[PDB]
Write a protein that binds this DNA or RNA. Structure first.
Ligand SMILES: Nc1ncnc2c1ncn2[C@H]1C[C@H](O)[C@@H](COP(=O)(O)OP(=O)(O)OP(=O)(O)O)O1
Ligand SMILES: [Mg+2]
Lengths: 538, 402
DNA sequence: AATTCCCCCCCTTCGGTGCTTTGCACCGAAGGGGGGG
């Protein structure tokens, strides 16, 4: 029925009126369910007939539920959503099975007709007017207004969530030894009681919900494992994702690649070693969604590896508060990292990847710090605490990096694990000039109008070399001058530059960059033994 | 009830809540349950479109959790400033005091009801572990702690409370900023605690910094007997940069030795003219720069640099190259194995000094990645205020602040 | 050419901002996708 709970007062934005949109034509197959649906709701008082006193209207349509036999009735409330007051969303995230604990007895409940059981504010009801078009044509359609929360209105989710929280609070107050995960109308109820007492308490909860007009049909009530909860299969002592199907097509379009990348990202939370960079590299520079993209050799190999990974079945375990959280990080190459969070070895609580490229130039240590930060945030969200990290970086390397770096950086309590490839810095800049080396005073300029410039060096021995540069910039010319100095020098060099930009780039010790010139400079810097780079004002 | 209104044309805070650890969430839940039982806060719904972040801190040697609300956006949008809120912007005698004690008087704010039309702007959300339930929304019914208008409305009551004490002790300067009371006296180091205890008893009935040990750090120059080309190049660059701060830096006869390509390692004998010039330049560098004065209209900017080995340098200024204050914060021990904790302590110390000296918290240019700070700064924060900060992503040059 | 809403995530793109060498680096919002109800 309709909940006796109090309505939430809703108002339009100041100076705005209700929508007056016209209903678009609908197929005859659609206008057999809406008429069937609207007849039913009108019987239960969820919608009310209106006359000519209401000048508002809004298009309605219908889609198919996951049942594939019922129809979900939706209203295109975009115009009303524009003029509706702002709400604050109370859903701050998504529950994860890895944050669940071992419970002897588990049940899952779904509220039937969730939104249509919560009343709508009386003064806001007139703005939800809609028309059900007549079959074929003629005989103008019946006009209704919503007495309950409509589907498609931007205020419905928050209002329903608050109403459900208010309904559940009296039950949870008097039953503190029972865990209730509440997501919209989906309720996961877990307890350590025996099955008989658990079923008695579930019946009590169902009666309490029915007292507030929230019905829980037996069709959507699960009592035996595995439980289909929030996209996962929950067993007594393990959890899995519901089966993930990857397309097996021969010709790939942009939309297909996007769907595959999204599905692989979803599957990466429990399947270890998922790589997606090569596939996602095909999505840049392409405009049309239906444009066919030939699969590159690198993308095909990564797709084959991912298909290999998904072949075997993997499972995750439940959280144990009495044990310790350990997050192990592995390098995957080309700025890709994987991580496994577990409490016991070879029993993963969850898995994940980090492959975000931040900054034009960066090294492995910065990316490892970013991955640690992401894992820390995710662990705080899920379990409420930071794990102990197993990183493939030596303690001396981290000590040198964080003591010589100009930024305040930190990694929480961690220990070194010897799993190659190891994280290291590929070169170091001397803090003092090298005695007996050769000194290259490098210069580089470029006029801003003609976009031509010069870049060269002079050494104390008496060698000079200038190379004109076309379609360059002053920063590019300075970088090119440093590159010339690195190229023409020996195994030890003392480079003196007038560029703060080039020095600031080089001092960060990057090993990958978005600029090819910086990449060549890095390759040259790796070869040398001692390099001293100094700044001098022009 | 004192009506409060936002600054004309402003909307209200709509800041999202960041995730919290389990202990912080448990402490917040207990504290907010007690507060709602006592009527200080009330549960609200989603029809309130405003939100501000909340978290919990354990104050220095307290073993008791305290709820802190980040009212920075609400503070920047509130007009309640006709009431200076400080009783005259700033006692200019607090900085020249032997000892200053900071006391927490924010609980006294929990007895003054807040204006009904303004309560909706004080809404906050408590999250849940593993998103088990939707976050619980509350709004304040009394004057909140951390809002700049709370001292502005309790100001009359605060002055009434302290009159029996201030009149009896005319040699003690009392300043109020947010929930903090700064008590500065020039008495003996023990008599100061005696007076502080008397003031605490007086406050209870009615319902330690050392600013004289604060010294600026002037820009210095290296002292060497034999000078190489590299040393002169590093010194010329330092003097050229310092010429922007101290007009009158010559550095013209020192650049003559830097003519012609030359080895960075070999030594250069300084000429008598170069030596004189360097001595004069050092003489100019040991005197404080004149022509710089604090402007109450403009805001304060604090820059922090990491010098390594547990050393940080900071400059508080209103205009570039005109530093109102320069200083160094050092806490090494065994490097403390934590840069974020050191930076947080430095920020708190600099903010306390700024409040004592000018009565305003500065805007910080933190030398840290944003994500690290937002992840870890709440674990070491111990102050009831939160200054505005921005994050730099550009590395400084060869640091001249040492 | 089917048209809806809210939430979290990833990956790419484009415009805004700041310091400076008016280019270059960084960041946030919006587009696509995945998942949930
Ligand atoms: N596609 C959607 N568009 C808009 N709102 C939706 C959509 N899917 C779900 N919701 C919202 C409105 C629903 O009332 C609420 C609960 O979802 P769901 O249980 O699938 O529907 P329901 O409770 O109306 O039907 P049922 O009787 O099948 O349980 O979530
Ligand atoms: Mg349902």
């Amino acid at each position: 029925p309709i909940s006796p709970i109090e309505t939430v007062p809703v108002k339009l934005k100041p100076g705005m009126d209700g929508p007056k949109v016209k209903q678009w034509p609908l197929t005859e197959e659609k206008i057999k369910a809406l008429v069937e649906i609207c007849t039913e709701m009108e019987k239960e008082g969820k919608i009310s007939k209106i006359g000519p006193e209401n000048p508002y209207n809004t298009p309605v349509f219908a889609i198919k539920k996951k049942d594939s036999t019922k129809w979900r009735k939706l209203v295109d409330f975009r115009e009303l959503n524009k003029r509706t007051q702002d709400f604050w969303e109370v859903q701050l995230g998504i529950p994860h099975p890895a944050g669940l604990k071992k419970k002897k007895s588990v049940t899952v409940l779904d509220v039937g007709d969730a939104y249509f059981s919560v009343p709508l504010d009386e003064d806001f009801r007139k703005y939800t007017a809609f028309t059900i078009p007549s079959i074929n044509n003629e005989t103008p359609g019946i006009r209704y207004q919503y007495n309950v929360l409509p589907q498609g209105w931007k205020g419905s989710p928050a209002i329903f969530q608050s109403s459900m929280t208010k309904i559940l609070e009296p039950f949870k107050k008097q039953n503190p030894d029972i865990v209730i995960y509440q997501y919209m109308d989906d309720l996961y109820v877990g307890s350590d009681l025996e099955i008989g007492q658990h079923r008695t308490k579930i019946e009590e909860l169902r009666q309490h919900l029915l007292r507030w007009g929230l019905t829980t049909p037996d069709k959507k009530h699960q009592k035996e494992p595995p439980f289909l909860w929030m996209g996962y299969e929950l067993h007594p002592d393990k959890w899995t994702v519901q089966p993930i199907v990857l397309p097996e097509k021969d010709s790939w379009t942009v939309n297909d690649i996007q769907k595959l990348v999204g599905k692989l990202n979803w599957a990466s939370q429990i399947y270890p070693g998922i790589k997606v960079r090569q596939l996602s590299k095909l999505l840049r520079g392409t405009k049309a969604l239906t444009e066919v993209i030939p699969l590159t050799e690198e993308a095909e190999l990564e797709l084959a590896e991912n298909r290999e990974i998904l072949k075997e079945p993997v499972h995750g375990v439940y959280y144990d508060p009495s044990k310790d959280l350990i997050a192990e990080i592995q390098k995957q190459g080309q700025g890709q990292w994987t991580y496994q969070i577990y409490q016991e070895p070879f029993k993963n609580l969850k898995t994940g990847k980090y492959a975000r490229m931040r900054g034009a130039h960066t090294n492995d240590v910065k990316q490892l710090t970013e991955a640690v930060q992401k894992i820390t945030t995710e662990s705080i969200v899920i379990w409420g605490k930071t794990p102990k990290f197993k990183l493939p970086i030596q303690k001396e390397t981290w000590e040198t990096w964080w003591t010589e770096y100009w930024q305040a950086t930190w990694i929480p309590e961690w220990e070194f694990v010897n799993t190659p490839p190891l994280v290291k810095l590929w070169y170091q800049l001397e803090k003092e000039p090298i005695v007996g080396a050769e000194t290259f005073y490098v210069d580089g300029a470029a006029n801003r109008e003609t976009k031509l410039g010069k870049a060269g060096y002079v050494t104390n021995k008496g060698r000079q070399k200038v190379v004109p540069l076309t379609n360059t910039t002053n920063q590019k010319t300075e970088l090119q001058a440093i590159y010339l100095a690195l190229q023409d020098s020996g195994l030890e060099v003392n480079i003196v530059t007038n560029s703060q930009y080039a020095l600031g780039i080089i001092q960060a010790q990057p090993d990958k960059s978005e600029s090819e010139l910086v990449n060549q400079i890095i390759e040259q810097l790796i070869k040398k033994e001692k390099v001293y780079l100094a700044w001098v004002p022009a | 009830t004192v009506p409060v209104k936002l600054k004309p044309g402003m909307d209200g805070p709509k800041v999202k809540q960041w995730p919290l650890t389990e202990e912080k969430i448990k402490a917040l839940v207990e504290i907010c349950t007690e507060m709602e039982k006592e009527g200080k806060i009330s549960k609200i719904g989603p029809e309130n479109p405003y939100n501000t972040p909340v978290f919990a801190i354990k104050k220095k040697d307290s073993t008791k959790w305290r709820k802190l609300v980040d009212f920075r956006e609400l503070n920047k949008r509130t007009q309640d400033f006709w009431e200076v809120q400080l009783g005259i912007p700033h006692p200019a005698g607090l900085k020249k005091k032997k000892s200053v004690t900071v006391l927490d008087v924010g609980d006294a704010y929990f007895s003054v009801p807040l204006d009904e039309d303004f309560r909706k702007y004080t809404a906050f959300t408590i999250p849940s572990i593993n998103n088990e339930t939707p976050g619980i929304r509350y709004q304040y019914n009394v004057l909140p702690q951390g809002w700049k208008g709370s001292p502005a409305i309790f100001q009359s009551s605060m002055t009434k409370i302290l009159e029996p004490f201030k009149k009896q002790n005319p040699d003690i300067v009392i300043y109020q900023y947010m929930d903090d009371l700064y008590v500065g006296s020039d008495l003996e180091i023990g008599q100061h605690r005696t007076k502080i205890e008397e003031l605490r008893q007086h406050l209870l009935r009615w319902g330690e910094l050392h600013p004289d040990k604060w010294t600026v750090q002037p820009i210095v120059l290296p002292e060497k007997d034999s000078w190489t080309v590299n040393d002169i190049q590093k010194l010329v660059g330092k003097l050229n940069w310092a010429s922007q701060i101290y007009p009158g830096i010559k550095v013209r006869q020192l650049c003559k030795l830097l003519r012609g390509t030359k080895a960075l390692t070999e030594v250069i004998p300084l000429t008598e003219e170069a030596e004189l010039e360097l001595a004069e330049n050092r003489e100019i560098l040991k005197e404080p720069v004149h022509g710089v004065y604090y402007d109450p209209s403009k805001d304060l900017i604090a820059e922090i640099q990491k010098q390594g080995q547990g050393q940080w340098t900071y400059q508080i200024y209103q205009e570039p190259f005109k530093n109102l204050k320069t200083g160094k914060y050092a806490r090494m021990r065994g490097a403390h194995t934590n840069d974020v904790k050191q930076l947080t302590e430095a920020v708190q110390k600099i903010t306390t000094e700024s409040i004592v000296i000018w009565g305003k918290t500065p805007k910080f240019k933190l030398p840290i990645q944003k994500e690290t700070w937002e992840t870890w700064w709440t674990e070491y924060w111990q102050a009831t205020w939160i200054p505005e900060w921005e994050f730099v992503n550009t590395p400084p040059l060869v640091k001249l602040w040492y």
